[PDB]
Write the structure tokens for this entry.
Amino acid sequence: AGQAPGPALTDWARVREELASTGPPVVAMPVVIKTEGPAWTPLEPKLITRLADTVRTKGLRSPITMAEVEALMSSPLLPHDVTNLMRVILGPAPYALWMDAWGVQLQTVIAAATRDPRHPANGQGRGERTNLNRLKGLADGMVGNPQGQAALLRPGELVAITASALQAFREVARLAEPAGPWADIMQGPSESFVDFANRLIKAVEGSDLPPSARAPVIIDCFRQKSQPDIQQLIRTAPSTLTTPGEIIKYVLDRQ
Amino acid sequence: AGQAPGPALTDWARVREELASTGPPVVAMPVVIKTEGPAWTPLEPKLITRLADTVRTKGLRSPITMAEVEALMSSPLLPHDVTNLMRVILGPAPYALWMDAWGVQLQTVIAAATRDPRHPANGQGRGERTNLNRLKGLADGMVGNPQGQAALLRPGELVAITASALQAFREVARLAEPAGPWADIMQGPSESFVDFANRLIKAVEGSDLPPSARAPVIIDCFRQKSQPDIQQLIRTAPSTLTTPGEIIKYVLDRQ
Amino acid sequence: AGQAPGPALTDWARVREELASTGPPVVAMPVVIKTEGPAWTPLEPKLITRLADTVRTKGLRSPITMAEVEALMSSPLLPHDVTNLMRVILGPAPYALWMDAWGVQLQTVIAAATRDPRHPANGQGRGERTNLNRLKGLADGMVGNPQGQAALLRPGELVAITASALQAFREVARLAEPAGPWADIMQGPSESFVDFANRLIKAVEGSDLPPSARAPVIIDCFRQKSQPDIQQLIRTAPSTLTTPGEIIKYVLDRQ
Amino acid sequence: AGQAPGPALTDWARVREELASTGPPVVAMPVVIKTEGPAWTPLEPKLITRLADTVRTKGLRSPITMAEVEALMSSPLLPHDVTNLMRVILGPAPYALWMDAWGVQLQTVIAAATRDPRHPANGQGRGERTNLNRLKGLADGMVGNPQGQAALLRPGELVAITASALQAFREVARLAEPAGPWADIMQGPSESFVDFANRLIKAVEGSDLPPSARAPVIIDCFRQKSQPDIQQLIRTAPSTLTTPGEIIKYVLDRQ
Amino acid sequence: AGQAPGPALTDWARVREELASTGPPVVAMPVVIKTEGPAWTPLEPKLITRLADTVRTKGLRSPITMAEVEALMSSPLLPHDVTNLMRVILGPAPYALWMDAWGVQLQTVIAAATRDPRHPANGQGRGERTNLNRLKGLADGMVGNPQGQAALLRPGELVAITASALQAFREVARLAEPAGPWADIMQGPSESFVDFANRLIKAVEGSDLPPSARAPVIIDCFRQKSQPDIQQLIRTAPSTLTTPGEIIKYVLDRQ
Amino acid sequence: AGQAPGPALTDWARVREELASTGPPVVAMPVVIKTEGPAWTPLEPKLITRLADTVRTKGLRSPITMAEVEALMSSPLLPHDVTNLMRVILGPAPYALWMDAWGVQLQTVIAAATRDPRHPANGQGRGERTNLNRLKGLADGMVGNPQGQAALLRPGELVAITASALQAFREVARLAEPAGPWADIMQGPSESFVDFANRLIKAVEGSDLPPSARAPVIIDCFRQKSQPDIQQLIRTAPSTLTTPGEIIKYVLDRQ
């Protein structure tokens, strides 16, 4: 039993968390292997906002959003937490999908609770068992009470809960690839072509396309979403202009 | 060791407040419950200042300002606090209307105070049965003595107070519509068209009209509330110039 | 016995202060009591300085300055301190008048001291009584001894002192009729018309007086305190011009 | 002894200090009295530094410099410290002068020592005496050793000391008629006529002698210490221009 | 006995570290010894980030990158750490290679382990020798347990490990010509020559080439990786132009 | 009893150091002492860095670098610290020389040792004497072991060590008549005349040169180290021209 020296290690999560937020397509590769703390795991709002941002921008056929969520759900999390996390990231419509899916995942645990009355999450006698009510939060002291849910549930059940949740999440997050951010990028008459080009180029830098498909998309935005007379100015540009840079030059020539 | 580890749980409350106070247009879906704490709950002044900003600017004409009071009035706190918040936010005349509404509201408690003694804000024995004077703060140890009210009142009496007050607020925050900030928006030689326009766009954003009413209202403050040669300049502008953007472009074109 | 659980409740004191400095026009109305505390108050430097800044800047000709000085004399404090505060705010000359006025004010307390001895600023038997030299800090161990004055005075006497002071203050702050800091605003070659004007607009922000007197006064002062060739330029200006902004426009046209 | 009350009743220290460092000619008028603390008084640099800044600039041709020293030398000070303080501010040549002057002062203490032994800076019995070598810092254990001086001295002797020091200072703060830093001021091609004019306005701001003498001096510092071609410009200027402002405007007229 | 006096004497490690981070080109010669402290060391993320910065920028065969790597591998660490670190700095492919090399090293310790079954890191009972599973973190209780690896492996073995690791790094850090970043310095129309040239000059400062080979390589880069039209401008350029500065001047001449 | 009340006394040292490092040519004059403290001082990194910066820039051309070194070697320190200080500031060539010089100094202790076997560093018998190996830190336990040196050396020995060290340095810091970094600053096309002047003003401010040798050198620096085409522009400048300011004006005339 506690307390154990020193603490602490290296920390790789601290390192990890750094490298990622420190040149992210350079990729944080150090393992992060966390044990202890309470039965359940505390939370950080910062991780949530930066996840909200990603959920805004990329969404969630991105494997950044997916990567950052995955990592966050290595946690033994309470039902109230899962509820909030899910309702927050998914918002009304997809949360329903998830809620349902997740309900199947619980249903599949009542199968394994029945197959194994004594698996990790499970108890050793008839009441002590992991039951529908536990799992749905309908047990007495769970419902309306996250501390009670925390006082009643075991870490094994919390992990089972978080996998079920992650599962139901993977099952739901495969819908609606068609991009996205770019579509709300229109040149302001307030804005310079270059400020726009840069805002857009930033979004394109942030796209997941093959570089070779980037430039046709960029040129389409230039052609379609700059300023009409400038679009027309582009119409007079040759086809011998073949990259946005050449086009940028053509505009720079006239100012 | 003991009691209640860590203290305590995690971190929805914090995350809510965080997330709210972060890019507000669409924010903060996690459920937050906060048991227990002292019998009553000392205030957050910053949240209250910015509420005053909202209450100033938009007021209660947003259900964001209203939404934010609601949230702030989940708190159990004392008649002195109710008083000090309401006098300050309402200002004299509407504070008076509220006062009257709040007494009415309190009158409905004197029915539920007689009818029932089982309720959280009432006692069983005659001396435990709650009196008017306590509920009106006109009880001994209450008048000129919040520490005394704090010392006399039960939690159930706070929620009751809070409920009569919120009701009496809901009952008063029906009154008034006509927008609003706009009425002070007019262009001097003190600011440029660009400056005025921005100030206006920011306001525009803050108006609650559907987008369909926004251009005609913008256009109207422009023609009459721009600088006099510039209103005239707008009178020379083609009718064909239809969105604000085009009209802005027409000003952009000539200096 | 003792002391004071938690401490504490709302704040309403700091909240009051806060609000005032948070949109000055109409803000800051909660009730503030401050319950119990040093009854032998050891003030705060910042609160005096910003008052100093108002006394310097505006002066004391303000029912807001007077108000904030009142508010600062809500405290139970020592005569010595009352003296230093008054010496700094009043400035030497009025301070002297005050000092006399305060002695008269104090003289009328020797009436209520002789009439009654029950009151908080007094004691029952002959020595128990609060003597004049004591009330004036003029008794032994008080002379050249504010701590000794603190050890010899009891709380009620301090409130009395404060009331006498506070009255004596009010009897002196009837003040001038000329206004104001404005009189030394004059355009040098050190500053543009715009800067000068803006400096004048700041001063106009500082004119609380009838909105209706401001533009004739401004046109006159602008005419007279502007740079001479500008004065003459204003001497060429149209009579039809009715506001400074029009007048600014006229200058704005020529350079 | 105690328990203490609390420590402790306050401020006018910070209030005093604050006001002075918040506009020096907007005189600080409270009163601060002091006791206690160890035998004597330790110091922090901010006042020493800001004094050095004064000592450089006006020095001790300001009766505010003399004043800020007078006040710092209200303190019960240990001789080594004093010695050093004087060694810093005076500089070797006047430091010497002081040294000699102080030594006389020290002689005058042997007078009050020979006359009497009843003083705070002396013992009553002959063994109790505050001898010459001791008075000189040069008694056994005082030699080279301010902690030993501190272990052998008495507070009454720190006062005695501080007076001896302070006196010898005052006789010597007789100093220079000439002024002042101003004399090195001459326009470089590094700086503009305006930069020179604002810098000369700092020199003027630091020239506190009659205003009526300031403008002739100012204009002279223009005539002889402006850049040469600008001098030549000033020669073309008419004697009709009678202020620096009028002259500044003539310059401003030309580019 | 223990723990440490005072704690403690200080600190050429800090001084070393300071100096390095203080105008890096030629600094940092104090000897730095530091035992005691932990049994084995939990690193500090900062050193890793800056190394990651160097690994990015320079890469890893530099005489300074190697120097900071040696230093980071100057004290015992877990296999787990070593793993994560090597995997991050080398990247998967070179890390894999690294493992291979490291394995050869690990084999070579099983020789020194067979040769001396009673070596200081080795066993002093019987089968509690330095085995492949220990060295691999796969001994019982080290299996998926970095804490268990830290609790079962002896410091002598960690040092042994650290040398093998370092060897395998030396053994691997024998590859890679590329220079490198440089290949991505081009001039888009997004940058001026002056920004580009500066970016390039920084990259050339960071070159290892003799200065005398630096200018032909910049001159070629200037000719080849400027904006095309800027290259045509360079194309007109005298053969007598013979430095980048002369080239810079040449462009400077034309706009 | 003991051990150190209050803390503390005046300061005189930190203040001293401040004043110096705040007004450098207007040098700080308090006497500074600091008994007691550690047995021997284990360095301060900021203070070593700022000496390092002086050692970079001026080094021992300023009797400031020495001054700061003297102050820093004004208390007893370890052979390892001394060694580390010397190898870092002298760097390899002058360090070797100093080792040698220091070795001479160590020889002179074996004389003073022979003459008095029981002088301050020594102790009763031979082993309490300070043998050569002790003096070299090569006595059993000191040997590559600065903790061992701290465990084995007395203060009396360190102060002989420190003196000897400082002595051999004073002896060594003679070499170099040439002045100063300046010889490596020339104009590029990368930065203009104003920036060259800035560098030049810096070199001038950094000259120790009599003021009278600064104009020949400065003008020489202009004729010889400015941009060539500018040196040529300068070749046309009148021979009457005497200061940089007239040259600056000549360039300005052509700007």
